[PDB]
Amino acid sequence: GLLEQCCHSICSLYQLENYCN
Amino acid sequence: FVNQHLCGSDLVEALYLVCGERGFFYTKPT
């Protein structure tokens, strides 16, 4: 579920900011 | 952002800005 929601759909930098160390 | 499909290195791009110098942790290149 990291790029699947952004590649298989759309996402917001909000939940994407969680993939940062 | 609003509605945009992120995929490939484009992911680290979204992270690049939010974190960038924070060294994000996206996945790798397959």
Side-chain angles (χ1 to χ4, degrees):
Chain A
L2 168 68
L3 46 63
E4 255 272 78
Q5 214 151 105
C6 304
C7 206
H8 191 33
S9 203
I10 288 87
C11 50
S12 22
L13 85 174
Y14 173 95
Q15 190 218 6
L16 177 118
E17 201 244 274
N18 196 276
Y19 297 123
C20 168
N21 213 17
Chain B
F1 307 128
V2 272
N3 34 246
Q4 210 132 111
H5 319 62
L6 259 297
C7 191
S9 187
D10 288 284
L11 259 296
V12 315
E13 200 230 74
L15 307 153
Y16 223 110
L17 192 20
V18 301
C19 259
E21 210 259 80
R22 256 70 178 198
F24 39 71
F25 188 76
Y26 158 89
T27 23
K28 241 121 214 282
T30 25

